[PDB]
Structures are given as C-alpha cells and as structure tokens.
Amino acid sequence: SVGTFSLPALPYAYDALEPSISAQIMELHHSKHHQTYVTNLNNALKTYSTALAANDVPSQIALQAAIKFNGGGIINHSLFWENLCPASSPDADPASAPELTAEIAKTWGSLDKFKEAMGKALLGIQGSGWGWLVKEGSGLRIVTTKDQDPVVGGEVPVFGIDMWEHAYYLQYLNGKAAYVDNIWKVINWKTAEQRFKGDREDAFKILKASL
Amino acid sequence: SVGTFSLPALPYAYDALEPSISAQIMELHHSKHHQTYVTNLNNALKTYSTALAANDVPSQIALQAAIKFNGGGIINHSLFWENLCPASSPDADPASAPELTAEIAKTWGSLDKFKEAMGKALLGIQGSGWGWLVKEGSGLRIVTTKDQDPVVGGEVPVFGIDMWEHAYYLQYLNGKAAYVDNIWKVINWKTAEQRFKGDREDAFKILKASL
Amino acid sequence: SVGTFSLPALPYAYDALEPSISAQIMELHHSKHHQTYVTNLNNALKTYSTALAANDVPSQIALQAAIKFNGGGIINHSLFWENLCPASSPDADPASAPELTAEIAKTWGSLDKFKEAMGKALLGIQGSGWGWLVKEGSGLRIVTTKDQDPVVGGEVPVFGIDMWEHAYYLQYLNGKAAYVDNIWKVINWKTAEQRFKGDREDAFKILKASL
Amino acid sequence: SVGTFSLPALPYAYDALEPSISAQIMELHHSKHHQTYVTNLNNALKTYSTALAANDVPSQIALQAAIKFNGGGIINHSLFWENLCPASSPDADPASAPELTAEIAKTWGSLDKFKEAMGKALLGIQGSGWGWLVKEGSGLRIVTTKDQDPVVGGEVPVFGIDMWEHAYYLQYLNGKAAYVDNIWKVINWKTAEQRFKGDREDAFKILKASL
Ligand SMILES: [Fe+3]
Ligand SMILES: [Fe+3]
Ligand SMILES: [Fe+3]
Ligand SMILES: [Fe+3]
C-alpha cells in the first residue's frame, strides 16, 4: 500500500564511522533527518494517492516538491549509509573495487587525482546538496545535486557524499574540507564496485530495505 | 479512473477571435498543442499510478516533469480559452467586471496603467511562459510562469495570457507587442470577474470540463 | 576600485544575542562564513572586470553564480546583523515600529498571526535559504529565497532571518522551530521600522559599511 | 570598449539553407531575433560597467538575467550560423569530419544511433531551448540548455540546434520532428570537426566576428 516507508537500520552502529564521523552526527542524521524524510514522504504519498484517483492535477503538481525533497531524501540517505563502512573493514580498502578503480584511473589518471576532482566538486556546492560518482553509459562522471534531488535521470549512482551542513557541522564546524578529507577513510568500496558493475535498477534495490 | 482527460471544445469557433487571433493559430493551438498536453498527461498519469502503487520513488520523481509540463498545459489552456471571448461579445467589455476593475484601479491607479504594467511583464518573459493576473489574499498581483508551470501554489488565477511563440508567431511574427495590444480586445472580463469573486477551488472547476 | 569589500564589524559583541543565538554561532557565522563571502566576492568581481574589459561574454556568464552567491551572501548578512539586537535593548521591542506593526496587523490581523505565517514559511524552506518580510508597493509580503539569493528584484527588505543550518545547528541541532521561536526575541524592530519607512536604495545603504 | 557588439553577417544568403530552413525564418531569426540580443546585450553591459565600478552588487545581480539571456543569445546564434551550411556543400557531408564521426560511432555505436539520441533530446526540450553535441574531456556528450543559456561551463561546443519555436514554426508549424529530420541536411560537419579538434577557447573565437 502507498506510503508505508520506514526508517531502515544502519549497517553498523552509530559510532562505527569514528573518527571520520561522530556518533552524535550519525544518530541525528539517521534518527532525526532521515526519519523526517520518511514520515513526510509517507504523508505526501498518501495525499497524492487521493489526488491521483480524483484526477486533481493542481493538487498533484503542488505535491511534487514534497515528494521530490522527501523521496530524494530517503533515496540519497539509503545509498549513503550503504556506501559508508568502518575504516577497519576490508570493504573500506579500494582494492575491493578493482574494476571501478581501474576505470577511475583511466578517467582521471589516478585515484588521488579523482579524489582531488571529487573534493573540488563537493566544496563547490552552493547551499545544501550532494556529490556523486555516477556511471553514465560506460563512462564515469562526477555530478552534484541540490538539496535532496536524487540521481534518477538514468545514471547509475556509484557512491555519494552528503554535503548538507548537518552532515559535518557539529564535528568539523565550517571545515568542510576536513570533513571531505576524512570521509575517504569510511567509503565502502565493496558497495561502490557492486554498483559500478550493476545497472540502475540493481543500485536502487536497497530501497526495498525501507519497505 | 486515472488519466481520462479529454480535449474540451472551445466556447467559440476557431475564427471567433479574429482579427486579434487568427483561425489558423486557434486551430493549431487547440487541436494540436492542447491536444498533445492531454494525451501526454494521460500517459504520464497512468505510468505514475503504477509507480505509486509499487512505492517506486525513483520512477515517481522521474515522471514529475511530464506531469507538471503536460498537467500545467491543460490547466493553463483550460483557463486561457475560458478567459477569452469574441471582441463583439458583451463579455469582452470591462464593464462586465465592476468589482475586479475597481480593485485594479485601486491597485495600479487605472485599468490603462494595469494593462501597460501587464504588457511589460508579458514582453519581459524570457523564453516560453505565461503572464497572470492573480488574487493573493485580498490583493491583486501580476505574475509570470515559465513553460507550462501553472498557478497552483495558492493564488487564485484571474486571467492568463499565453506568451509561447506558437500563440502569436504565425500572425505577428516577432511582434509580440502587437499581439499583446490586440489580445486585450478579446479578454473575457465576465470570466475574470467570476474568478475574482471566487476562491482557488472555484477557479479550477473549469478543469471538470476536461473530464 | 573593483572588489574592495571588507567584513564589517557587528553592531554588538558575539555573545550579545544570547540566549537566543550562542556566541559560538555568531563568531563562526560572522568571522568565517560572512568573511568567506567577502573574499570570494572580491575575487569574482575582479575576474569579472577582466572579462568585461575583454568583451569575454562566456567568462562573464560563467562568473554569475559566484557573484550572485557571494554577493548575495554579503547583502543578506549585512542586513541580517543590522536587524538583530540584544533582547534587553529597547530596539527589540516592536513598539519601536509603530507604522510597520500597524501595517502588519492591518495585513495579517496581528503581530502574533504574522509571526505564525513567517515561521511556517521559514520552516518550509527546503535546503538552505532565507525568509524575508519585504515591502512591495505599499503592501507587506513574506518571501523566501534559496541559498544566498538576495532580495534585489525591487522589493524593500524589512527584515530577514537566516535558515541556513550554520545559523542554528550548533545550538538547536535539528530543532529549527525552536530557533525561529527564539530569534523573534532578538529582532531589531527599530531597524525594521526605518527600512519600512524608506525605499530600496535606503535599505541597501548599509552595504557602504562594507566598503 | 564595453558593449560594442554588432550583428555579424551570415556565412550565406538567407535562402541558402532551403528547403531545410526557409528564407523567411533565416531573415527573421537573424535580422530580428539575433539583432535584438545584440542590442539588449550592449545596453546591459554598459549599465553593468557602471555598477561594477561602483561596487553596486544589487544592481549587478539584477542585471544578470539580461546578460545571460542576451549574451547567451549572441553566443548560441554565432555558433549556430557557423555550424550550418547549404545541403549541397561538401561541408554538409559527415565525411568532412572523420575524427568526430569516429568518436561518435565509438560513443553511440553509429552516426544513425547518435542522430536518434540527439533527436530524442531535441524533441524532449520543454519550452524554449537548445540541443548541443559537446566535447567533455575526451568524450562526446549530448546536452540541452533552456532559453538562451550557453554552453560556457567548460565543455567544448561541437554543434548546436535551435529548438525555439521561432526557429521552425513558420515553416513546420508544430511539426518539430520534421524540422529536426531536415536540419541534419544543413549541419556543417567541417565546422563540427574543427571544434571537435580544438579546445574551448578555439570554439569561442568566432565571437570576435561580432566585435
Ligand atoms: Fe543528510
Ligand atoms: Fe500555448
Ligand atoms: Fe548565514
Ligand atoms: Fe533562436
């Protein structure tokens, strides 16, 4: 039935990504922000179902902002949690992603040059938004999205990094560069490799965990 | 059932607004452009229903552009045809709208100053879009919208003027100023008065004619 | 010469707005965020000077986002600091704004009902942005802007409230409703009255303090 | 000096692209639309120079829409005329672009599949806009822009196709699919090859013809 999303459990404990991301941020980010996207998405979807059945197009259009924002919220965060992992896990080793890192090096020259390019895009975001490594056709691209806009246009998301201030401010204050530098330690390259090899639908299977 | 919109008949013949708007434009604008919005809206709505029932949020967000564009298309054109009428009709006489014209004069000083102000907004639109007289709270405002974006945010639409090039180009070429000057002759002030007296829901009842 | 903006001093100490806004936030918000908008604006403006002299239109257009973002940043924050004051100051008393509060009560019914309307708009902002009371013509309107977009389209800014997460997160966490509730306590109604009685250029004279 | 742009002559007579594009459209498109962008750009730039020298940021931001719209107008149309040519010219033969067509086949599989992809993108534009083949890094990409937004973000424009209704409506009416089918005959693949082989600066040197 429509609008039965729930907050999925994290793949790890709230303090599992320290020192890169504090337990305080993880708990707030998950239990509060992600939770709010779930609740407000469900409310919008139930309202939309009525308007859709009634062929009430004005109400449907007026509901789009709530669905894109909160729906994008659960999409982006579902992907986000899955492509993070504890620094001690083997999945944080980029050796877990031989084909992806091979294509990264082909495209940007090296993994370090890619990290530099990605960092620049993340720090260049004006306001709230996300940075993404995506697969487009066979090639890789760095893209950013504003607010909670998701990567649903056709590309395969490989991994994303949240640049909303609530993702880092309590720990890094205005130092978003330090946040980005440290998040590399907790990137889940096993997840990234799997998405790189799969297609768009494969990548979004994770959303089933929220239903 | 979902997606059963049809093209409503015009309140007048295709040549009824000459010389202000040619019969060629009216026929193309109605039988082709408005028709296409109807057909593509219905298809998008049915596809959305599938995604909504499946809680497929990525597909829903990807469909929003088609629903807003084609849904706004049928909304704006339904309102547009209704607030046009033959120049010889009494409804084109602004005396048909005593309360609205009184509020216009209170707001812009006179009807002539409003029309001049409105023209400036219409001619200032970059690309495709619409100009609207709307009621917000108790006051009147001139607003513009891009492409087929409709006035569904809460304001009451009073009347709109289509500034897409297909609304005038065959007859006026690049002379959109002449188009605007001549469309005043075929504005349906009876409709404008009715919407001014009603609320938001009242104004959109015209959409029932497309179902 | 082009691009000689500097960070203006606050009208009060960093801890002067406590308990509504913490000294930590004020210092970070002013010395870091506002400072960065100043620095990046000056550099963008100088780069623009090069492009204008060269009639390099591609470069000019590519620079617009940096000028709007950082230029809006210094505009919005200059206005922001000026329309805040200590809760103990007489200027925080809305009695300091007889004409404005009369028009507010005229417009929304009462000051409390206006505060309710404003709060809803502020809390409805998706992502980063600002809420503004503005004077348009003779009437008052609540408007929101995204990111650092400023109110430069013609309205007279009366007062603004920053809803970027860096404006409240350290103190209120995700509780933006509590932030809004408490910021009313430090609104400078003397400033608001002055802007309300003046025109657009009058309101932006404050920018001279940054030159 | 600032704001001394002029309308460059076409590389051919107004009727040289028939039957693909009528002489009536070419004359209106060039002598009227492109001319207006030139005039309104010059006026915006002269006003901007004053605001820039005065560090008047509000005025600079308020002028951005006019500079982007009219500046993009002259950029896009300058490139547009240059990448069109008579259907009988050898430059209209894709054999004139061996390196480009080779990369196209690598990217989309074949020239026909690229044309199919481009056509879909062009016909999918909502409202006014442009479709572009661009070079990003070493790869080719199809992108669309709204209104007169130009491709100034870093990519090298290879060729563009105007999808504003004034580019085809007088001749094709609502039949934009027929317009796209026929414009392939007058694409200047010699020009496209040169841009593909050059860098971004190389591509925009054509603007010098407007000074
Ligand atoms: Fe987040
Ligand atoms: Fe239309
Ligand atoms: Fe701020
Ligand atoms: Fe054009």
Automatic annotation (TrEMBL), chains A, B, C, D:
Keywords from the UniProt entry: Manganese, Metal-binding, Mitochondrion, Oxidoreductase, Transit peptide
Molecular function in Gene Ontology: manganese ion binding; superoxide dismutase activity
InterPro entries registered for this protein in UniProt: Fe/Mn_Superoxide_Dismutase, Mn/Fe_SOD, Mn/Fe_SOD_BS, Mn/Fe_SOD_C, Mn/Fe_SOD_N, Mn/Fe_SOD_N_sf, SOD_C_sf
Binding site for Fe(3+): H29, H77, D162, H166
Binding residue positions for Mn(2+): H29, H77, D162, H166
GO cellular component terms, A-Z: mitochondrial matrix
Domain of life: Eukaryota
Short name of one Pfam family: Sod_Fe_N
Catalytic activity: 2 superoxide + 2 H(+) = H2O2 + O2
Known function: Destroys radicals which are normally produced within the cells and which are toxic to biological systems.
Sequence similarity: Belongs to the iron/manganese superoxide dismutase family.
Name by which UniProt lists this protein: Superoxide dismutase
Organism of derivation: Hypocrea jecorina (strain QM6a)
